[PDB]
Design a protein around this ligand. Structure first.
Ligand SMILES: NC(=O)c1ccc[n+]([C@@H]2O[C@H](COP(=O)([O-])OP(=O)(O)OC[C@H]3O[C@@H](n4cnc5c(N)ncnc54)[C@H](O)[C@@H]3O)[C@@H](O)[C@H]2O)c1
Ligand SMILES: NC(=O)c1ccc[n+]([C@@H]2O[C@H](COP(=O)([O-])OP(=O)(O)OC[C@H]3O[C@@H](n4cnc5c(N)ncnc54)[C@H](O)[C@@H]3O)[C@@H](O)[C@H]2O)c1
Ligand SMILES: [Zn+2]
Ligand SMILES: [Zn+2]
Ligand SMILES: [Zn+2]
Ligand SMILES: [Zn+2]
Ligand SMILES: [Zn+2]
Ligand SMILES: [Zn+2]
Ligand SMILES: [Zn+2]
Ligand SMILES: [Zn+2]
Lengths: 373, 373
């Protein structure tokens, strides 16, 4: 078997920033203590991965990004008790050590293992993939744009065998974040009026969340009018584009709802919309959840009076879900015909066609692209 | 009687900003439809009143400030049905029409009638005071540094007759704000560790709030060490001064609590301290309530990652209390010996000694000074 020896395989390595991917043969060192080596079956293309290339999100290069996926367990390391080889799992970019401060805190989730610093290694303070002698860095405790990867046990959730790898892979980042941001983070209330800024893969996920919450009205806001039709299929009661009017978006939504915007979700990644998403929620009882990651090295400049009058402004990391616990239950839900992930997946391509997936994304012609292996 | 005629009396008029008060003979007009003319018995000095004179709070001039008070109803206009002359009432700077959007929403309170914009006038766009021919503007739908004042029915809470005026007047701003800030707005959890930025009159009220919540550890932060003693009496577990160490406060409180600071309240009004208060709470599950009023026309500049990690940031007005409903309830709790409001009252001076009251505060030698008539 391979269990115990260096594996050689294909990987969409990224040598520099703003540089294109190049599929290359790498050396997946076998798992160490409490580590697991996974064989990736399917991996989706999320906006975060695209951020790395553009420079909007820093990382150590060379890197093997990707984090939204699902695979089978090839071999487990020393001590691995939660999963055995053959098990269907989903790597988790947000760990759940079950011992750290937040992991202990019922209203927390950002484990101490989490890598939002751009460390590019595992707990061991080291890398598993090699290439041309050169070591290559991990991405957010995961790295799924590769045939095989190694993740700490703290980053592995075991899901149902019946789960179709192409659909459930969305649950590793896109759907769990969006859905949770509405249901968990913002705790949308039945009857409220939600408005989503960004009709992307994660945005539509929130729309679904609001739909499960019972939101009476859901307004989809997006620059690309071609997204509306799908947003509405998912649950949007109406959508609009910021350019439809010359008067501020906050005044638009204000007059549209009758100054009743109860919730607002920023799922884009721009400072400006982080502010008009805030402003667009009711000055007193409106909540504005920031789901999109702000551009690296940028500082937001705002009017405190927006917050002072009573606004609740909260951040969101993986829908505030506790990965090792929620990922499993969420997958069961999908199988329970609760929701339809099919409506988010617009393109399924083979890994070799990874550049087509990305471009289709930047072209605004694909919600979620699934790269199957 | 007076009921129906213009009253003449003394009031602490402020002709210009940066200018000293000036006790003068004013003419308080009789109340119009659904308005109430009240005779002020006691009025405390809030830091907000001081903001007006310093310019950090925009208001039209001339203006009769003051809003933390209690008095008795002298005459009621037509339609007034909630109160009758003789009644002991508390003027409300934050109205409660019971019909606007915020009023009808359970988790809101900033009623549409509020004057957070500096209008300086009653619902009918007019002012009741006059002085040397010249019109004098109200302050926050109240204006209490006068022997008499006129307010709209939506800004009048009918209290318990037995309530002592120079004590329950704190429930009109100071105590209601601070207490509600921790109990209602921030909903402090039993066992939590809270930190208070500012040990003034409102700050101390927050400590009493957290203490009521069951906060296992409360840390008071103030740069004026002489207030600590009072804080500790109020409920503080320990106090610190930002100057006591060179290592930024956020790192200090973290080392102090083992990165378990769950709640933070900014009760001072400085942009820099608002930042320090955000950073000071747990990056994933920490809440940071802003109670201080941010300086006029100034923007806040911070790092969005602080919020993105999961922190809750919320503003606070009147401790999130629904005025006409909560103020009465609060007073009774007071008479029921629930809280010791006397621990906040450091001075009681006659109205004409107002300037000393303000000096007392600016010299950091008084928590809450009550100016009695
Ligand atoms: N915090 C998290 O857990 C988390 C999870 C997933 C994704 N993200 C972040 O979410 C954001 C987007 O992710 P996605 O995967 O859903 O991407 P996506 O590309 O599919 O969607 C981007 C959406 O934003 C719209 N948009 C961009 N600029 C706009 C503007 N100026 N005004 C209005 N609309 C505009 C696009 O048209 C599209 O509708 C990024 O910040 C990504 O890093 C965060
Ligand atoms: N939002 C509201 O509903 C509401 C209600 C009442 C009062 N307020 C605001 O309350 C805020 C606090 O004022 P207050 O009424 O309690 O009176 P205050 O002036 O006495 O409180 C200031 C307190 O904070 C301390 N302080 C001042 N600058 C500081 C700094 N740089 N670093 C650390 N500590 C500092 C002072 O020593 C004092 O203890 C004011 O800004 C006032 O506008 C707001
Ligand atoms: Zn992602
Ligand atoms: Zn953890
Ligand atoms: Zn954009
Ligand atoms: Zn006040
Ligand atoms: Zn005027
Ligand atoms: Zn109202
Ligand atoms: Zn100060
Ligand atoms: Zn006492």
């Amino acid at each position: 078997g391979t269990a115990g020896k260096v594996i050689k395989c294909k990987a969409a390595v990224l040598w520099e920033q703003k540089q294109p991917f190049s599929i290359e043969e790498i050396e997946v060192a076998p798992p160490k203590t409490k580590e697991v080596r996974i064989k990736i079956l399917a991996t989706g293309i999320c906006r975060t991965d695209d951020h790395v290339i553009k420079g909007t999100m820093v990382s150590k290069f060379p890197v093997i990004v990707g984090h939204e996926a699902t695979g089978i367990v090839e071999s487990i390391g020393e001590g691995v008790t939660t999963v055995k080889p053959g098990d269907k799992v989903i790597p988790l970019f947000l760990p759940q050590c079950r011992e750290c401060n937040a992991c202990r805190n019922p209203d927390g989730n950002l484990c101490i293992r989490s890598d939002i610093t751009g460390r590019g290694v595992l707990a061991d303070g080291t890398t598993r993939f090699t290439c041309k002698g050169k070591p290559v860095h991990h991405f957010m405790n995961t790295s799924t744009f590769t045939e095989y990867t190694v993740v700490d046990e703290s980053s592995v959730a075991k899901i149902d065998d019946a789960a179709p790898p192409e659909k459930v892979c969305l649950i590793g980042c896109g759907f769990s974040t969006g859905y949770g941001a509405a249901v968990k983070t913002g705790k949308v209330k039945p009857g409220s009026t939600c408005v989503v800024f960004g009709l992307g893969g994660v945005g539509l996920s929130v729309i679904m969340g609001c739909k499960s919450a019972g939101a009476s009205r859901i307004i989809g806001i997006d620059l690309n009018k071609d997204k509306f039709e799908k947003a509405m299929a998912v649950g949007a009661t109406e959508c609009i584009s910021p350019k439809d009017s010359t008067k501020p978006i906050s005044e638009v939504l204000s007059e549209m709802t009758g100054n009743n915007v109860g919730y607002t979700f920023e799922v884009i990644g721009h400072l400006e919309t982080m502010i008009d998403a805030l402003a667009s929620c009711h000055m007193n009882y409106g909540t504005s959840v920031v789901v999109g990651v702000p551009p690296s090295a940028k500082m937001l400049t705002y009017d405190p009076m927006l917050l002072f009058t009573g606004r609740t402004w909260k951040g969101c990391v993986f829908g505030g879900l506790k990965s090792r616990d929620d990922v499993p239950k969420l997958v069961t839900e999908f199988l329970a015909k609760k929701f339809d992930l099919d409506q988010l997946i617009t393109h399924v391509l083979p890994f070799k066609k990874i550049s087509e997936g990305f471009e289709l994304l930047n072209s605004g012609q694909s919600i979620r692209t699934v790269l199957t292996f």
